[PDB]
Amino acid sequence: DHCARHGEKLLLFCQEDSKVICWLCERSQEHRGHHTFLMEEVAQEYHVKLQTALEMLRQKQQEAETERNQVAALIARGKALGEQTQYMRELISELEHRLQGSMMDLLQGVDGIIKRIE
Amino acid sequence: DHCARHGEKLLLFCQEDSKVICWLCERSQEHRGHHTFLMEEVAQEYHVKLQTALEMLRQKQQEAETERNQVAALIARGKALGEQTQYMRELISELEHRLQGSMMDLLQGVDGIIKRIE
Amino acid sequence: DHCARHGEKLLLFCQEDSKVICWLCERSQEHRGHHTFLMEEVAQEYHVKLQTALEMLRQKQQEAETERNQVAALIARGKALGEQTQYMRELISELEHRLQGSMMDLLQGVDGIIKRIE
Ligand SMILES: [Zn+2]
Ligand SMILES: [Zn+2]
Ligand SMILES: [Zn+2]
Ligand SMILES: [Zn+2]
Ligand SMILES: [Zn+2]
Ligand SMILES: [Zn+2]
């Protein structure tokens, strides 16, 4: 891909901004001093973490459905378990989208995703 | 633009040499250790200084014309004031040319321009 | 030339790996922290050292052939002198190959060559 501001290849990844950028972006005062990595290397790095969180979330979801079934203030526990199961469902959806997308789609905003997991 | 020595894009600016260069030029022993910036950032920086110097030079020119008019060894002061008015006349033209030109045309040799102002 | 891993130009030279690489290779964890130079400058630098070592090795070889001829445990000295003359023959051949080859072929493994000279 190519940068909107500069038109150069998007091969670097800024951690603080959690945003893909080119070298010229790295040298500007906007991203000056930040820590920047190679897009491919960080892509391999985060892909594993989001996959792991995907398996963990799937297990937790199966357990949540089992618990919700067995429950059938038990009603309150059922409701809260339902809302939680929904939130997890959406999270899993986003993780699958990122894992099947391009490296840029995966990295852009990964900080927010990992914050959401925790 | 493209580099004569290397053929790469001219996107960096070396302060010590006050010359626009590419990354390969930055990494050579010729410009090794110098401080280099992004052409756009230093372009915005110097544009303001040459604009300010433009206003200042215009004021000094108006005042010079007023003084020369009122003078009309006062004659010697008239002649010298005339020569000065000529030099400034050229300087203002150069400042407008640079300010209305591209970033490269503005930065190339700006050191000599600012040296001329002072 | 172009990089196998990344497809970018091979314009840099890693001293530790004594290997020509592109910028992306420089920023990977593989070559992170290493000392990297411009390929052309180090090529011009090493060309002179291998040329000097070439002349020196040629002189030493002529002297070695003269000594081996004059020898005709002197026999043991003849044998060892012969083996040495062979090793030098191969070294000189490699030096000529590198000096007439491309910058990459010259630099790739130059550390091993200079170690072989000594
Ligand atoms: Zn950019
Ligand atoms: Zn940044
Ligand atoms: Zn250059
Ligand atoms: Zn310089
Ligand atoms: Zn590479
Ligand atoms: Zn290396």
Alpha-carbon distance of A17 to A2, in angstroms, equals 18
Q: How many CA atoms lie within 13 A of A83 on its CB side?
A: 5
Burial class (CB in 10 A: 0-12, 13-18, 19+), B107: buried
Contact (CB, 8 A) for A39 and A110: no
Interface check for A89 against chain B (CB to CB < 8 A): the answer is no
Alpha-carbon distance of C38 to C41, in angstroms, equals 6
Interface check for A38 against chain C (CB to CB < 8 A): the answer is yes
Strand ranges in chain B using DSSP code E only, listed in sequence order: 12-14, 19-21, 36-38
Q: What are the respective helix, strand and coil percentages of chain B, to the nearest 5?
A: 65, 10, 25
Q: Which of residues 48-77 of A touch B (CB under 8 A)?
A: none
Residue at token pair 């070695």:
C64
Give the DSSP letter of residue B21: E
Alpha-carbon distance of C18 to C43, in angstroms, equals 12
∠ Cα A117 A115 A87 (to 5°): 40
**Measured in whole angstroms, how far is the alpha carbon of residue B101 from the centre of its chain?**
12
Q: What Å resolution does this PDB entry report?
A: 3.3
Could you tell me the CA-to-CA distances from B50 to A25, B14, B38, C30 in Å, in that order?
Answer: 26, 18, 18, 46
Alpha-carbon distance of A40 to A58, in angstroms, equals 27
Alpha-carbon distance of B44 to B37, in angstroms, equals 12
Alpha-carbon distance of A90 to A105, in angstroms, equals 17
Alpha-carbon distance of A106 to A97, in angstroms, equals 8
Mutation for C interface: B8, B24, B26, most C CBs within 10 A: B24
Contact (CB, 8 A) for A3 and A21: yes
Which residues have C-beta within 8 Å of that of residue C8, sequence separation ≥ 6? C2, C22, C23, C24
At position C50, the amino acid (one-letter code) is: L
